[PDB]
């Protein structure tokens, strides 16, 4: 269609077949037919017309690729020229990570609606994946403050790594 099914999965659709157990006519069936004739059909033709115009003028746009530069770990201290590139990279990855957590949150919300009253059991995978990604995001970026930077992120990581070393030292 338009989006990738892998990034935004949707289980296969299973609609039951009509099994009328009444002699009465179904009002929804005739309303659906009227909707197709009076709404879907004229709307579809107007779109097919517009698509005929867009095919006569076909042009492209691209997704910007960003080459990787050295991280703030490789920057000599107070070396602004290398700090600037690492800092800009870190900010780009920060925004992307925000959108990753949004994708995982959108999967979780779609599952909860889709599964209805069975969501508590049928959305356990999406809950787990959301829990893991939120934990990773919290470790990277939480508590940095409004004036966050790659330097502050590194200091937060080093503090976390030091505690992990000490806890293992206990073992």
């Amino acid at each position: 269609d338009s989006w990738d099914k892998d990034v935004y999965p949707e289980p296969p659709r299973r609609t039951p077949a009509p099994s009328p157990q009444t002699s009465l006519p179904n009002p929804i069936t005739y309303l659906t037919k009227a909707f197709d004739l009076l709404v879907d059909r004229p709307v579809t033709l107007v779109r097919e017309f517009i698509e005929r115009q867009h095919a006569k003028n076909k042009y492209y746009y691209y997704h910007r690729e960003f080459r990787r530069v050295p991280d703030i770990t490789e920057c000599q201290e107070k070396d602004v020229l290398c700090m600037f590139e690492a800092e800009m990279q870190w900010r780009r990855d920060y925004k992307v990570d925000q959108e990753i957590v949004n994708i995982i949150q959108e999967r979780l919300k779609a599952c909860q609606q889709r599964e209805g009253e069975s969501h508590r059991q049928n959305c356990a995978k999406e809950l787990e994946q959301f829990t893991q990604v939120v934990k990773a995001y919290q470790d990277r970026y939480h508590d940095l403050g409004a004036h966050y930077s790659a330097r502050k992120c590194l200091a937060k990581q080093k503090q976390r790594m030091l505690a992990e070393r000490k806890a293992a030292k206990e073992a």
């Binding site: 600037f84 800092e87 780009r92 409004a146 004036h147 966050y148």
Partner: protein, 459 residues
């Protein structure tokens, strides 16, 4: 920034070389064209600010403030040209020159990349503002108001000057880009306690901080309408903008230095909202409303979180358009009854129906009705303050109750009830007055459709 500085300067020759009957037409038309081109500043990137040269840069914080500043100059001209009609021609041109020179210092202040250049322009706005208040105010008290305005600001600014020069001596630079990479933490000491205070007190006085706010009810009341419009909309935001920038170099000392000033603000807003309930002067009521709203901005800047910085930026823009509109609304009444007393003229919705609609819309934005950007900013600040400490929801909640009471009290007292019998010169609203009202409210309500451009750098 020369594409805005130069044309802003060219407004001065334009005004002085205009025909005597076209000074308002020409200046208003061309200040609107400058306002139009300011939208080119919204070429903002996710990672990098827009850095034009060694002198000036623009980011998502300064860009909306710049756009608000250049939009206000046309509106200040329309608001002024009625009560200056009898004024001598050359004195009219000088009045416009002060407004233009104020805009020039503001657009450079919000874009100066070096903090000492920011300081000089930050201070240069005092001169035109002081002249506007004292020369063209109406009352005897305008002279005292100018003195309070001048010395409250300078008492805080002079320590800031010493602190900035000290920071340049020790760090080697005051360029803001450099300060982002060369910043070092501030370790506890009595020496650093006073560096922190000298870096923050000048900006707190401008906000104003509760306790240091006495200059504002005097200055915002004695000024001519244009002076009040710029004082409330923009000049108060020099304090907020300055704090947002300098707090970068004050960490982690802001952790405990913020406590006395968060307390003054959290309690200050409840005190200054309550004051508005018993205010007898309509302009004074509006002025005390600004103190209550800017208390949230102070708290949001001090707690220093991504949500509070977005909320602070939204509040500063939203308050600028709302508070300016309210002063203009109250001025229209004053230009009819020549008094600032709120209870003097009542039941005005009966005599001025359309202008009563503007009163309602201005009041609703003031009490932060969702989804106005006033609510967006005020809500984001409350969200982040709750995380800072859950009990702050009690003070934020109470302030929201009191703010609705005085916002609708002002609407009810002036617009509803019975008209005062002996006041018989309430002429119908002029086109100029209706247009001036709609040029505040319409942009304010449009921004709800696209609020991301007024949420600042942390969006």
């Amino acid at each position: 920034m020369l594409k805005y500085i130069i044309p802003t300067i060219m407004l001065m020759p334009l005004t002085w070389l205009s025909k005597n009957n076209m000074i308002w037409v020409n200046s208003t038309a061309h200040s609107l064209l400058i306002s139009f081109t300011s939208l080119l500043l919204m070429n903002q990137f996710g990672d990098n600010s827009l850095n034009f040269s060694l002198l000036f840069f623009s980011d998502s914080l300064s860009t909306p403030l710049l756009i608000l500043t250049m939009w206000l100059l046309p509106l200040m001209l329309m608001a002024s040209q009625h009560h200056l009609s009898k004024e001598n021609l050359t004195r009219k041109k000088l009045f416009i020159t002060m407004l233009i020179s104020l805009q020039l210092f503001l657009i450079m202040t919000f874009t100066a990349m070096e903090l000492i250049l920011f300081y000089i322009l930050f201070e240069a706005t005092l001169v035109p503002t002081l002249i506007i208040i004292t020369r063209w105010g109406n009352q005897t008290e305008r002279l005292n108001a100018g003195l309070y305005f001048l010395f409250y600001t300078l008492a805080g600014s002079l320590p800031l000057l010493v602190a900035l020069i000290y920071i340049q001596n020790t760090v080697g630079s005051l360029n803001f880009l450099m300060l982002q990479y060369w910043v070092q933490p501030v370790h506890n000491s009595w020496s650093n306690v006073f560096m922190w205070l000298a870096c923050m007190m000048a900006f707190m006085v401008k906000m104003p901080l509760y306790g240091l706010h006495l200059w504002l009810p005097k200055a915002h009341v004695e000024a001519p309408i244009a002076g009040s419009m710029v004082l409330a909309a923009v000049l108060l935001k020099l304090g907020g903008y300055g704090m947002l920038r300098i707090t970068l170099i004050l960490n982690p000392m802001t952790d405990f230095m913020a406590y006395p000033f968060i307390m003054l603000s959290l309690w200050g807003m409840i005190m200054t909202s309550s004051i508005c309930l018993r205010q007898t002067d309509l302009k004074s009521l509006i002025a005390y409303s600004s103190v209550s709203h800017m208390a949230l901005v102070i708290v949001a800047i001090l707690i220093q979180t991504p949500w509070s910085y977005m909320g602070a930026t939204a509040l500063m823009i939203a308050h600028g358009l709302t508070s300016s509109m309210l002063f203009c609304l109250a001025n229209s009444n004053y230009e009819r009854i020549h008094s600032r007393t709120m209870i003097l003229a009542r039941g005005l919705q009966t005599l001025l129906p359309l202008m009563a609609t503007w009163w309602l819309l201005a009041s609703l934005t003031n009490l932060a009705l969702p989804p106005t950007i006033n609510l967006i900013g005020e809500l984001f600040v409350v969200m982040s303050t709750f995380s800072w400490s859950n009990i702050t929801i009690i003070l934020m909640g109470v302030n929201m109750v009191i703010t609705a009471l005085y916002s609708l009290y002002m609407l009810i007292m002036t617009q509803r009830g019975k008209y005062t019998y002996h006041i018989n010169n309430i002429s119908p609203s002029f086109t100029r007055e209706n247009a001036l009202m709609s040029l505040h409210i319409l942009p304010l309500l449009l921004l709800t459709l696209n609020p991301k451009i007024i949420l600042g750098p942390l969006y």
